[PDB]
Short mmCIF file of C-alpha atoms in Angstrom, two decimals:
data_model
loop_
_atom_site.label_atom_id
_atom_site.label_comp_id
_atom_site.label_asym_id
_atom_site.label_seq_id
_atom_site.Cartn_x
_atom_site.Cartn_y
_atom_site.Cartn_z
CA UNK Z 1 -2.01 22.69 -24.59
CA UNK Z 2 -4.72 20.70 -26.24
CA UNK Z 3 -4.03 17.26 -25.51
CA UNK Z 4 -5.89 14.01 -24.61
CA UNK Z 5 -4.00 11.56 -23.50
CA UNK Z 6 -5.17 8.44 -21.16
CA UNK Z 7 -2.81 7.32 -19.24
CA UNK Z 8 -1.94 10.93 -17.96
CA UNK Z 9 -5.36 11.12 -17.19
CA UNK Z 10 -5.68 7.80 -15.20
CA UNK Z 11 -2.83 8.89 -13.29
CA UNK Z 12 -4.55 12.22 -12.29
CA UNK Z 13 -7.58 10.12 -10.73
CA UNK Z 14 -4.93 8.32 -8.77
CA UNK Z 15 -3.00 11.96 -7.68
CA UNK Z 16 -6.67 13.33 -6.48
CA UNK Z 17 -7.74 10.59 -4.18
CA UNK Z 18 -4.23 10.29 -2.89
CA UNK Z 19 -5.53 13.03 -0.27
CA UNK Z 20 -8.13 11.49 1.30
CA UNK Z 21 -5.49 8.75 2.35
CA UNK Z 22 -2.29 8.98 4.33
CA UNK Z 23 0.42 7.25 1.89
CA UNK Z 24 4.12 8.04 1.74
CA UNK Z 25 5.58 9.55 -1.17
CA UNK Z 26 8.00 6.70 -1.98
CA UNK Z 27 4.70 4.79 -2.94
CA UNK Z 28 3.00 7.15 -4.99
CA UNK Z 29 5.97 7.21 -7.57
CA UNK Z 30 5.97 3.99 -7.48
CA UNK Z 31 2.04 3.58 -8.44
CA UNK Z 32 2.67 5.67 -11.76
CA UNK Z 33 4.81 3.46 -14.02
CA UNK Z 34 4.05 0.23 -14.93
CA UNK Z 35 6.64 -2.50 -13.86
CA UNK Z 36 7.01 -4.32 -17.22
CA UNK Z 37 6.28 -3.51 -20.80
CA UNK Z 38 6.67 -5.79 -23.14
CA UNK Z 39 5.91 -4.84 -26.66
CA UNK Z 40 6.41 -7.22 -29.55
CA UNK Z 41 6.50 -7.82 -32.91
CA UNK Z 42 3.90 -10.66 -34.28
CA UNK Z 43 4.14 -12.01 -37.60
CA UNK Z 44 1.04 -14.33 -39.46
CA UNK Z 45 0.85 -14.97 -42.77
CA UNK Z 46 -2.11 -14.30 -45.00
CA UNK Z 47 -3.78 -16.22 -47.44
CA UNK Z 48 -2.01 -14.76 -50.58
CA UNK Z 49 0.92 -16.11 -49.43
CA UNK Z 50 2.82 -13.11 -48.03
CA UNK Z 51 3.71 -12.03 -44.25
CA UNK Z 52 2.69 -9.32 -42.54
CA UNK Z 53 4.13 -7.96 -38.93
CA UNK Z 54 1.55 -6.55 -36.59
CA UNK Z 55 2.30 -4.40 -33.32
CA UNK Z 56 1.48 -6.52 -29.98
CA UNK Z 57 1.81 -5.06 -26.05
CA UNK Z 58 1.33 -6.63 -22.47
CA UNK Z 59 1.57 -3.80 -19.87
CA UNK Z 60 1.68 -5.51 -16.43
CA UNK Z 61 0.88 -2.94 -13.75
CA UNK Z 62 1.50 -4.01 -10.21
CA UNK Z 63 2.33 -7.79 -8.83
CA UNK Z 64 2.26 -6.97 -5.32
CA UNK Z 65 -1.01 -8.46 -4.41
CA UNK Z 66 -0.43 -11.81 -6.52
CA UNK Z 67 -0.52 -12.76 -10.15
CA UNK Z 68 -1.44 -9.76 -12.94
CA UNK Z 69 -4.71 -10.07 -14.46
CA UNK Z 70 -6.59 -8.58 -17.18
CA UNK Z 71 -7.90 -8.20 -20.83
CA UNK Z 72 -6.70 -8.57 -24.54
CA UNK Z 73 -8.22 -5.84 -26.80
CA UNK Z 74 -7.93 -6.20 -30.93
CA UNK Z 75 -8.64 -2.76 -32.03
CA UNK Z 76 -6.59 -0.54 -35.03
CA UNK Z 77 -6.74 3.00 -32.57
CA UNK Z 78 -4.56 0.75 -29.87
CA UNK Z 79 -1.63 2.91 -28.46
CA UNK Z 80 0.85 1.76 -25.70
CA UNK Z 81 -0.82 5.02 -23.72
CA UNK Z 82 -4.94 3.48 -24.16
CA UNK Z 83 -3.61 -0.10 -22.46
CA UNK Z 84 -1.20 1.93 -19.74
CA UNK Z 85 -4.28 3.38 -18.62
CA UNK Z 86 -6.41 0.32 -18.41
CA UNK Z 87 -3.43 -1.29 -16.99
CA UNK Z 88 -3.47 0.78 -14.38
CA UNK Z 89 -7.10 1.13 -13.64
CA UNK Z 90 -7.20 -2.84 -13.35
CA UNK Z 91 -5.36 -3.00 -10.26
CA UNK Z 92 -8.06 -0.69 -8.59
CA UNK Z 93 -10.39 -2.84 -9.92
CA UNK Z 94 -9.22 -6.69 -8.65
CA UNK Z 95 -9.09 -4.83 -5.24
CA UNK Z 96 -12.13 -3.21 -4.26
CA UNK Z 97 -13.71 -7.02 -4.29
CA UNK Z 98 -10.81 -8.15 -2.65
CA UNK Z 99 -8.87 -10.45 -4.99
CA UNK Z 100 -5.50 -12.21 -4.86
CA UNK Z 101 -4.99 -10.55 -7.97
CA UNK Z 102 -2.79 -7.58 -10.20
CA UNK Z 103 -3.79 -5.19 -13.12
CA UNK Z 104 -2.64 -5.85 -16.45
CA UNK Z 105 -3.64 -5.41 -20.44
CA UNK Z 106 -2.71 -6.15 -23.50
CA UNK Z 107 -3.40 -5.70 -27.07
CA UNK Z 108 -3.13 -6.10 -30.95
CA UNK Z 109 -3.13 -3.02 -33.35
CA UNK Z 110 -5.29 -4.81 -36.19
CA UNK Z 111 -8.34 -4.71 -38.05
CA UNK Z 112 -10.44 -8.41 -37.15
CA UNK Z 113 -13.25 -7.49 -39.60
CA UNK Z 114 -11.01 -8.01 -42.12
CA UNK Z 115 -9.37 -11.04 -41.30
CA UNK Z 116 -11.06 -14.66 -42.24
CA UNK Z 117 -11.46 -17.40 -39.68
CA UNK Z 118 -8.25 -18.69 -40.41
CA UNK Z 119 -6.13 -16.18 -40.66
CA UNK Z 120 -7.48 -15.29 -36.63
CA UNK Z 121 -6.00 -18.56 -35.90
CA UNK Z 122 -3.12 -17.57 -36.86
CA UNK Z 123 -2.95 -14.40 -35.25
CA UNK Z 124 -4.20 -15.37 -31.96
CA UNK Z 125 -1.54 -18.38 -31.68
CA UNK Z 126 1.17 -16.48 -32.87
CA UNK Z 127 0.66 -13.57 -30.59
CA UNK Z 128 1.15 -16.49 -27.26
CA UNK Z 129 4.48 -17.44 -29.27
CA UNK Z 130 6.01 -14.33 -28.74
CA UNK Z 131 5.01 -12.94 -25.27
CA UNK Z 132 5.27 -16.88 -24.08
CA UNK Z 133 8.00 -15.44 -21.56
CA UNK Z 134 5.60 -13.11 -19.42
CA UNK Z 135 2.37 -14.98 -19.18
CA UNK Z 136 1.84 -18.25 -17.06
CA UNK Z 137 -0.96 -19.59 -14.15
CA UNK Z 138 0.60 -18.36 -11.57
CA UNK Z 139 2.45 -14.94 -13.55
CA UNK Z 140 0.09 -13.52 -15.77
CA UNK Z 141 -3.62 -14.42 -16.85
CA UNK Z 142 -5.34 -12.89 -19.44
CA UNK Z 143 -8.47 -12.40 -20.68
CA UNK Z 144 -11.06 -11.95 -23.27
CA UNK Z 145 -12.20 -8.18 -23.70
CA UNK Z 146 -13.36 -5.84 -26.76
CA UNK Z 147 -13.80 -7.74 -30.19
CA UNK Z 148 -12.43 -10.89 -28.73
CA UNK Z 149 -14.65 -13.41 -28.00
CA UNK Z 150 -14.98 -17.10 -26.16
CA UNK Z 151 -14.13 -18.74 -28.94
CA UNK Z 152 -10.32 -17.17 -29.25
CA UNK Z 153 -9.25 -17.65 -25.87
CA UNK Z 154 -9.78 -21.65 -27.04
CA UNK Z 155 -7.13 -21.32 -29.33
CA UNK Z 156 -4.73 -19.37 -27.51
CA UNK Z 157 -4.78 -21.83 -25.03
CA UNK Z 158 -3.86 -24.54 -27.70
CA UNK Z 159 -0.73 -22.67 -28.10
CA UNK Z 160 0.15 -22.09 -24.84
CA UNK Z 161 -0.37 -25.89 -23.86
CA UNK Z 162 2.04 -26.91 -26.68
CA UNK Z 163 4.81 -25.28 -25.80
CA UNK Z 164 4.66 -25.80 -21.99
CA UNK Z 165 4.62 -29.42 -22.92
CA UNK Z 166 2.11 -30.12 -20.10
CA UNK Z 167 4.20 -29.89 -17.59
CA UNK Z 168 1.53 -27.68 -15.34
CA UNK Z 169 -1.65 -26.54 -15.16
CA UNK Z 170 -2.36 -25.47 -18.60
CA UNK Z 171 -6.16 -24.64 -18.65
CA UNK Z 172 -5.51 -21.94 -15.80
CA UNK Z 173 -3.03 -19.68 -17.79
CA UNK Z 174 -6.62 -17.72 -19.69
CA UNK Z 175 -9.83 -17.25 -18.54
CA UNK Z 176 -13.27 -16.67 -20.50
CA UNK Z 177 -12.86 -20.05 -22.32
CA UNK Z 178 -15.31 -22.57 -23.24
CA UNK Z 179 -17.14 -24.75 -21.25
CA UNK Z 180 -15.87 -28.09 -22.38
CA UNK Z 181 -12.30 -26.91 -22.69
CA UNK Z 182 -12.25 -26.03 -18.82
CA UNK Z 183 -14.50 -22.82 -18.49
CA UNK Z 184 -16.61 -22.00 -15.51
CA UNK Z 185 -20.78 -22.25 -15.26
CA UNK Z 186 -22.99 -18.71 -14.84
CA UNK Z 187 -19.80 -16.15 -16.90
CA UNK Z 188 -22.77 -14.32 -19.56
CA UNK Z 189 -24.92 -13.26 -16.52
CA UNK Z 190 -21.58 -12.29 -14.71
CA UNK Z 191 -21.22 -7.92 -15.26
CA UNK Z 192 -25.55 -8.07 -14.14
CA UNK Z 193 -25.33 -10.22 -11.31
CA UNK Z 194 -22.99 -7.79 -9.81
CA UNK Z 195 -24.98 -5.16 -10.23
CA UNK Z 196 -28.03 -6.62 -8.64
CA UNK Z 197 -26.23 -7.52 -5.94
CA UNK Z 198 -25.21 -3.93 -5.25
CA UNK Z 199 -28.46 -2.46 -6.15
CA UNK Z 200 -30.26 -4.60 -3.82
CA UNK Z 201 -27.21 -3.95 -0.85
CA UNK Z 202 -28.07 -0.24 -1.64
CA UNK Z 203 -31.50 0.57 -0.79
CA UNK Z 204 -30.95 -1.49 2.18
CA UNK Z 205 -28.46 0.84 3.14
CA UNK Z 206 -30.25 3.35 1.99
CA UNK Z 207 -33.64 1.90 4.13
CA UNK Z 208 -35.60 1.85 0.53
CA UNK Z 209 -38.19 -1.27 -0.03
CA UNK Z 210 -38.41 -2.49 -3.49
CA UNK Z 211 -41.26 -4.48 -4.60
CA UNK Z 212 -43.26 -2.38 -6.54
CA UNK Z 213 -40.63 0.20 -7.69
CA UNK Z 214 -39.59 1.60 -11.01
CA UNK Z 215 -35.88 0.88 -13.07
CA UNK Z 216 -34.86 2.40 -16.10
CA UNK Z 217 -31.87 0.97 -18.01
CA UNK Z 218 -30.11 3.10 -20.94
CA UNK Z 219 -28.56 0.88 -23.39
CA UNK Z 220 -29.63 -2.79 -24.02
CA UNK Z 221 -26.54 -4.75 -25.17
CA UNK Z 222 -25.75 -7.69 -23.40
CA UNK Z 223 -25.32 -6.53 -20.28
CA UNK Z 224 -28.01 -3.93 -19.79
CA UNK Z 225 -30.28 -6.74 -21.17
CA UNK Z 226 -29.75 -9.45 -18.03
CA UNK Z 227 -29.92 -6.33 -15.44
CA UNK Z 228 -33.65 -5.36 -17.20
CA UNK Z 229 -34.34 -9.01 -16.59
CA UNK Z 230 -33.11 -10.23 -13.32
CA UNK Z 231 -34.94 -7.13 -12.09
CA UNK Z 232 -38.03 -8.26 -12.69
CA UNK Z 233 -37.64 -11.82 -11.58
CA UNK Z 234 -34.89 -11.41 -8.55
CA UNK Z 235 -35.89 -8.38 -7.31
CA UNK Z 236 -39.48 -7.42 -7.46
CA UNK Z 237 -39.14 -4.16 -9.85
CA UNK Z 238 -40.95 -2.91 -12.36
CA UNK Z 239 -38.81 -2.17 -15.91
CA UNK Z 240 -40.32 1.19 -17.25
CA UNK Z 241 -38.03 2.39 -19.61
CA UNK Z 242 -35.51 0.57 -22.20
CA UNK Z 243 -33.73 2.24 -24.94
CA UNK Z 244 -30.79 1.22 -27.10
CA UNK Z 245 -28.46 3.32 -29.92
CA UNK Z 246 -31.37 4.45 -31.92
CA UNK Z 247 -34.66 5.52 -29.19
CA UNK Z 248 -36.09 4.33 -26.50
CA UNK Z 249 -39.28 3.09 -25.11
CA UNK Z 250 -41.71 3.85 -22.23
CA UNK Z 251 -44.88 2.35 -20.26
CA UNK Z 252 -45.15 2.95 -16.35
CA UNK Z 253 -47.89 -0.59 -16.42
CA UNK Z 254 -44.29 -2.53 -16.83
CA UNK Z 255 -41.97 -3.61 -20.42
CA UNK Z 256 -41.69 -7.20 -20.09
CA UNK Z 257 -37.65 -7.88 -20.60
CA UNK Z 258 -37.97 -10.71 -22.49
CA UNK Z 259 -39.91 -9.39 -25.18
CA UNK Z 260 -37.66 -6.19 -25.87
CA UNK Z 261 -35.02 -8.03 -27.04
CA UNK Z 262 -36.88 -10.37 -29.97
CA UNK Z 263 -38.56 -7.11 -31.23
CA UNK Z 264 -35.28 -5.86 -30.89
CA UNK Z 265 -33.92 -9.32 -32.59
CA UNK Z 266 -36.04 -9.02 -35.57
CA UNK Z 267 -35.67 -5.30 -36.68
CA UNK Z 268 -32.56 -3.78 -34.96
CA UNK Z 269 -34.19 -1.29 -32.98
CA UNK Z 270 -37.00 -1.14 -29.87
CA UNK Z 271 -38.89 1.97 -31.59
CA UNK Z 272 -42.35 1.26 -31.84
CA UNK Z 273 -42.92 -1.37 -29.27
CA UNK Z 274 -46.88 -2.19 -28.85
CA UNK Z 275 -48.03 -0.82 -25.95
CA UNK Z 276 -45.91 1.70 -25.03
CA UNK Z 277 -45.05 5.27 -25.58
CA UNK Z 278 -41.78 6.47 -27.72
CA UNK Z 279 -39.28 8.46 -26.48
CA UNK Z 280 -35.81 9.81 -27.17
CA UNK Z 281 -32.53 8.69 -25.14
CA UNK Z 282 -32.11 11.73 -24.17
CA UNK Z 283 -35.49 11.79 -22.06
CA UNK Z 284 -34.52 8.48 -20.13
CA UNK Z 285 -32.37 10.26 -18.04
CA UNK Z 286 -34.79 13.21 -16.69
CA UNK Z 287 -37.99 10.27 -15.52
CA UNK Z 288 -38.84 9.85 -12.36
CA UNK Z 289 -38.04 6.25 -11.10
CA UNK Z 290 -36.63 4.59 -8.28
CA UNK Z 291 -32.99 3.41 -9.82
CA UNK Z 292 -31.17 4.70 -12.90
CA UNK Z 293 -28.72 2.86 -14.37
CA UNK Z 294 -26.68 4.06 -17.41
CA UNK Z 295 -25.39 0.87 -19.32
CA UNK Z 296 -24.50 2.28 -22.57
CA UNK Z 297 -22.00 4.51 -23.18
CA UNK Z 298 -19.56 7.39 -21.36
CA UNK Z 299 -20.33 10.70 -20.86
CA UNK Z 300 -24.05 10.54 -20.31
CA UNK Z 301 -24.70 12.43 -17.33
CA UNK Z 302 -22.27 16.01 -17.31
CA UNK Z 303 -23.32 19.76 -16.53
CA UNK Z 304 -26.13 20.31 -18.03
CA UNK Z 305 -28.43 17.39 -17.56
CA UNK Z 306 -27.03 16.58 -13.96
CA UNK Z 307 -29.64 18.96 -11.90
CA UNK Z 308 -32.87 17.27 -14.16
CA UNK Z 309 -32.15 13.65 -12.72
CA UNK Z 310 -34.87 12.44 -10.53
CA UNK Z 311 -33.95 9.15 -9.04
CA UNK Z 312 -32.56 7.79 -5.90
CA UNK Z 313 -29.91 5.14 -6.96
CA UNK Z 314 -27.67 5.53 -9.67
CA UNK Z 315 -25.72 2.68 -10.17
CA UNK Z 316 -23.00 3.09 -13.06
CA UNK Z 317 -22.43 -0.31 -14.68
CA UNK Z 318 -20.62 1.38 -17.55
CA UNK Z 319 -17.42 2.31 -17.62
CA UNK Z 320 -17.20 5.89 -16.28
CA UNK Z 321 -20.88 7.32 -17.26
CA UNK Z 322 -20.92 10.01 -14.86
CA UNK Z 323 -18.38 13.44 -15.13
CA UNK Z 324 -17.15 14.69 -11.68
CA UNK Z 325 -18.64 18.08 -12.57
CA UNK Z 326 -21.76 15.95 -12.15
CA UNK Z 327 -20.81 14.02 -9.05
CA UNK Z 328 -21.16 17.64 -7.05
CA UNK Z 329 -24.48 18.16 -8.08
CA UNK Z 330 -25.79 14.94 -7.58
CA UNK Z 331 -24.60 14.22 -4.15
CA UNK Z 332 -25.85 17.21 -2.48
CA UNK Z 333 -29.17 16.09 -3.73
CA UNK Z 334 -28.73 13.08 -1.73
CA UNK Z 335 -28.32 10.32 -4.48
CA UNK Z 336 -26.53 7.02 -3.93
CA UNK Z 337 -24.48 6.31 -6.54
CA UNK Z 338 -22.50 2.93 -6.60
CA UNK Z 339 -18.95 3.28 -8.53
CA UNK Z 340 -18.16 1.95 -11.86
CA UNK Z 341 -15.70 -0.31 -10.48
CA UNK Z 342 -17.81 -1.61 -7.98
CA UNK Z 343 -20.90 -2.22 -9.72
CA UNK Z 344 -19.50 -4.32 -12.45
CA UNK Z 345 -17.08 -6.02 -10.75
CA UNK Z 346 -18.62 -9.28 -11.58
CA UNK Z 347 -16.75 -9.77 -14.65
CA UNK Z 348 -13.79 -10.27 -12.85
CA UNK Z 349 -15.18 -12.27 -9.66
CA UNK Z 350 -16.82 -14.90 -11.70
CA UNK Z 351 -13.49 -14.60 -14.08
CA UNK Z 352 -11.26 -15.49 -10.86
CA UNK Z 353 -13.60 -18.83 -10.06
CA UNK Z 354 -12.65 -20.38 -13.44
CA UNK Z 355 -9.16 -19.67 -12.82
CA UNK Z 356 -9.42 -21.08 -9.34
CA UNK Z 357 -11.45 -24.32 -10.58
CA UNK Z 358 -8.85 -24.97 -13.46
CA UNK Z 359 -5.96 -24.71 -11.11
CA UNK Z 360 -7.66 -27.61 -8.38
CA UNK Z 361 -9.17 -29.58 -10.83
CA UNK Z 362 -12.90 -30.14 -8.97
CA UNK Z 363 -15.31 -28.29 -10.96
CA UNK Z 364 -18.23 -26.27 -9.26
CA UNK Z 365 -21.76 -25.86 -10.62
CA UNK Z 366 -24.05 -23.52 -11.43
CA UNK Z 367 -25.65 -22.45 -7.73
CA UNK Z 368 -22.52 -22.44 -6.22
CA UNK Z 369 -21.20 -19.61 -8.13
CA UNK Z 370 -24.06 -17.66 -7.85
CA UNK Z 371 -24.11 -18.12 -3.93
CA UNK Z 372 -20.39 -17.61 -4.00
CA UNK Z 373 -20.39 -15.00 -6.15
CA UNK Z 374 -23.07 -12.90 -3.13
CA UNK Z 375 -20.46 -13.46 -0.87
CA UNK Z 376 -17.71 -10.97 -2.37
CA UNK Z 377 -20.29 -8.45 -3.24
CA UNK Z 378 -21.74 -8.17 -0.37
CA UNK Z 379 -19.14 -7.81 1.61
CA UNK Z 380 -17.43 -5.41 -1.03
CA UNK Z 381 -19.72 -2.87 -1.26
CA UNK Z 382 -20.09 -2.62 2.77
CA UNK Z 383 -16.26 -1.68 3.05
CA UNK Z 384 -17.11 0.92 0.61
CA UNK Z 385 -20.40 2.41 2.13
CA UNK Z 386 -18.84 2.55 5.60
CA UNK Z 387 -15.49 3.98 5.08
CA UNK Z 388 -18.16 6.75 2.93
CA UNK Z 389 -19.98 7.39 6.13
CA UNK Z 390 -16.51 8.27 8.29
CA UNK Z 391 -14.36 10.59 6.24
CA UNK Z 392 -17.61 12.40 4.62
CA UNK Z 393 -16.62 11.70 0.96
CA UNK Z 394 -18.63 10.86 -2.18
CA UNK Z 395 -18.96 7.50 -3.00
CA UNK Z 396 -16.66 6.97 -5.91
CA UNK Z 397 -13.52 8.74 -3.81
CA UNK Z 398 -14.28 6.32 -1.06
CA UNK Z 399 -13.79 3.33 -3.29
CA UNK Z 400 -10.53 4.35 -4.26
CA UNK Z 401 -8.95 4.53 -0.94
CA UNK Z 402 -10.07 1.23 -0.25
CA UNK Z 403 -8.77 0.19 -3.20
CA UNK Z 404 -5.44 2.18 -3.03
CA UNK Z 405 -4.36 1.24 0.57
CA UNK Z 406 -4.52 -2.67 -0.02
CA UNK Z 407 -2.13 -2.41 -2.61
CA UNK Z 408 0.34 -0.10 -0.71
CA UNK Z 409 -0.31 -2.18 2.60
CA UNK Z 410 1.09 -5.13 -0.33
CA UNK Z 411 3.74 -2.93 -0.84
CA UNK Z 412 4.41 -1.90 2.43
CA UNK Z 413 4.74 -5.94 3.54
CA UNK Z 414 6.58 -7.20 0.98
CA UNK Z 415 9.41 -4.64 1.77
CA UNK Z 416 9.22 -2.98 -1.97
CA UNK Z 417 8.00 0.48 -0.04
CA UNK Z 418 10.51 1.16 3.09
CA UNK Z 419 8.36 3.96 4.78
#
């Protein structure tokens, strides 16, 4: 009866916006199971001087479209089921911006806060050593994801260079590394640049000007940091409203990005900013501004606090803010929201140009990401916003038929799929 599971449940997405789309039934089976999991044992040894065996996966969803892609989580609640879902909601995510790309995950059940700086050496090499057979440039690329970091993907490449003896292109088998190893200019602004990009493609479509208006951004980790501040300088808005775990903050005369973040920096916290006015996170949601944008956390906007929104744009750059109970009430208001997988898609876009710079060699700068990086976006989110105004759908089912029916159109050419 009572039971949670995720991959169940990131199969049941896939089984609801399966009507919206004409797609055989041969295909749909063969969308539900990943196509190789390989789960291994990997052995360190400790500083004591004693071994110990840890639990390692690498779910690879669906190669149809070109080589898998996707992160490496180091967490202690990992199951085979929590990187089967992610797996799986990868592939609708290297899509919708059009990639050569598959889904894929993979993942470590340990502890990291309790492991030195050598002993996650250790672990990080010897996890390439046994999964050496599946990954590769051109087979499967990972990634850096939740407690991982830029400085671990260095070393796994190390490993992976060693035993491939150099015979190939050894600096494009993992992304999210360095820059003087072989990583890419403009990667921390990556997941805000995206949204920007769709923010500003939205009130255009939506016939809304935008100097002079009002954003509020819940949570200010990285990533709802750079979309407070490229708002201000990029677009022409006004940041109101900030808040992080603890409370939030308020002044409609304008909170000046940069400045959050060194209070923030010295304390831990924004309460009691100078010049502003306190409030709760709670009463973020219920302003009334121009664009919302939930960056912190899921399950923010459900049943009760749908109907007290008053904003025009709400663009989810977290991962699955907003419950469909909530999508029903919103939309008949007449609110724009821009999906999850679609509004911070620039984590993988600008994570495919280092893996096409390491592959060619000629390294690209700093502008010509950025103007690159408009390019996809762009052109992304207006394959989503017009296939929205033909069948009459809400905004996050139309995103996954476009990103359903290039991977069975894969399918269907590459003669996996007969009908």
């Amino acid at each position: 009866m009572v039971e949670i599971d995720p991959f169940e449940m990131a199969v049941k997405q896939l089984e609801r916006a399966a009507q919206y789309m004409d797609i055989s039934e041969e295909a749909l089976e063969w969308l539900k199971k990943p196509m190789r999991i390989v789960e291994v044992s990997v052995p360190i040894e400790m500083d004591d001087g004693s071994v110990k065996v840890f639990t390692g996966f690498r779910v690879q969803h669906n190669w149809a479209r070109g080589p898998t892609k996707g992160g490496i989580r180091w967490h202690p609640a990992e199951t085979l089921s929590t990187v089967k879902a992610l797996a799986t909601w990868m592939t609708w995510k290297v899509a919708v911006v059009d990639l050569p790309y598959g889904g894929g995950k993979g993942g470590i059940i340990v502890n990291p806060k309790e492991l030195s700086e050598r002993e996650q050496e250790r672990l990080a090499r010897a996890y390439i050593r046994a999964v050496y057979d599946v990954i590769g440039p051109w087979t499967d690329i990972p990634a850096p994801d939740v407690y991982t970091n830029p400085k671990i993907m260095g070393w796994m490449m190390d490993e992976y260079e060693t035993i491939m003896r150099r015979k190939g292109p050894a600096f494009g088998v993992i992304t999210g590394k360095p820059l003087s190893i072989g990583g890419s200019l403009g990667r921390g602004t990556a997941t805000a640049q995206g949204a920007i990009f769709t923010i500003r493609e939205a009130a255009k479509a939506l016939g809304i000007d935008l100097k002079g208006k009002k954003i509020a951004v819940q949570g200010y980790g990285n990533a709802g940091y750079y979309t407070a501040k490229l708002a201000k300088e990029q677009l022409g808005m006004t940041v109101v409203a900030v808040s992080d775990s603890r409370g939030g903050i308020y002044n409609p005369d304008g909170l000046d990005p940069d400045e959050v973040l060194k209070w923030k920096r010295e304390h831990g916290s924004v309460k009691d900013f100078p010049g502003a006015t306190n409030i709760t996170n709670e009463e973020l949601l219920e302003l009334e501004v121009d664009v919302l944008a939930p960056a912190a956390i899921e399950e923010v906007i459900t049943e009760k606090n749908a109907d007290n929104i008053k904003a025009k744009i709400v663009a989810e750059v977290a991962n699955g803010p907003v419950t469909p109970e909530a999508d029903d009430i919103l939309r008949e208001k007449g609110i724009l929201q821009i999906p999850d997988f679609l509004c911070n898609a620039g984590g993988v876009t600008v994570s495919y140009f280092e893996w096409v710079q390491n592959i060619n060699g000629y390294y690209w700068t700093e502008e010509e990401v950025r103007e690159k990086l408009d390019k996809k976006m762009t052109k992304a989110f207006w394959e989503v916003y017009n296939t929205h105004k033909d069948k009459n759908i809400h905004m996050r089912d139309a995103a996954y038929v476009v990103a359903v029916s290039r991977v069975y159109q894969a399918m269907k050419d590459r003669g996996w799929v007969k009908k």
